Amino acid sequence: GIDPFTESVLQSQATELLQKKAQLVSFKIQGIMKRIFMGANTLEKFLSDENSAINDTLKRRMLSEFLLANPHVLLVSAIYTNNNERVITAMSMDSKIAYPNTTLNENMTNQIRSLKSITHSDPYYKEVNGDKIYGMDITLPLMNAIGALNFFLNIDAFYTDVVGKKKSNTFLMGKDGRLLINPNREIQDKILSAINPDRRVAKAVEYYNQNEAGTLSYHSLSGNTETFLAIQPFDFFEEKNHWRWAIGKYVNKSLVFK
């Protein structure tokens, strides 16, 4: 406390460690998401093939295998709009893969036929078997499009990837400071600046918007104290803003400085 040398050393050490840990979490998430999108690309080639010996049954098998390999995906749907309009859906709930019957509504329909690049929805709670599951829809055009591939990314399935096996001071942030994952589940889907008066939050969101890693001092909700907070932004999808998340990790100044 009394010593500026010690303080500088301890601070620098603690904020470097914070950033290192946040980078590891984000790298793990990116790896998970890379596998999702690679598989979705593979599925798109099979589901959109002109001259296929593949019937709806074998399409179902491949969709269910996608789910087996990617447990962070709750369901996946091959939606055809061209002719013989139909929805083929595999869904993974509990440990069993079902094939619910979806009828294509005019809501989904035209959005799909004019679709010419990948999109995603805003995060939302989907009701399933009386439970709300936090996630988002991701939609790829079946290629001029003959229909669409849609899957529901289960954001809740990333809970342990973000927070760890033990509770920790780690969260996943989305657009404008929205909390996608938080150890305190009840502040999920909340805007951070709307539930935290600390105006240094803006600098967090700004690190996010600028897309570089950075640290800042920050008053936490879960600890109600002064912390260092690291922000690690990363794209959860790569094309060549819209597909950007960030890991937040923080530590009590009272702990850093003895």
Numbering used by the authors: 28 to 170, 175 to 271, 276 to 293
How does the study describe this entry?
Extracellular chemicals are sensed by chemoreceptors, also termed transducer-like proteins (Tlps). H. pylori tlpC mutants are outcompeted by wild type during stomach colonisation, and TlpC modulates the chemotactic response to acid. In common with family 1 histidine kinases, the TlpC LBD has a dCACHE fold, and is composed of a membrane-proximal and membrane-distal PAS-like modules folding against the N-terminal and C-terminal halves of a long stalk helix, respectively.
In this paper, we report the crystal structure of LBD of H. pylori TlpC in complex with a small-molecule ligand that co-purified with the protein. The three-dimensional structure of recombinant H. pylori TlpC LBD (residues 34–297 plus six additional residues (GIDPFT) at the N-terminus, introduced as an artifact of the cloning procedure), was determined by X-ray crystallography using a single-wavelength anomalous dispersion (SAD) technique to a resolution of 2.2 Å. The TlpC LBD crystals (hereafter referred to as form A) belonged to the space group C2, with three molecules in the asymmetric unit related to each other by a three-fold pseudo-symmetry. The ligand was bound to the membrane-proximal subdomain. The lactate binding site is located in a pocket formed by residues F202, L210, N213, I218, L223, Y249, L252, S253, and Y285. The carboxyl and hydroxyl groups of lactate form hydrogen bonds with the side chains of N213, Y249 and Y285, and with the main-chain amides of L252 and S253. Our analysis of the structural basis of lactate recognition by H. pylori chemoreceptor TlpC changes this paradigm regarding the mechanism of sensing by dCACHE domain by providing the first example where direct sensing of the signal molecule is mediated by the ligand binding to the membrane-proximal, rather than membrane-distal, subdomain.
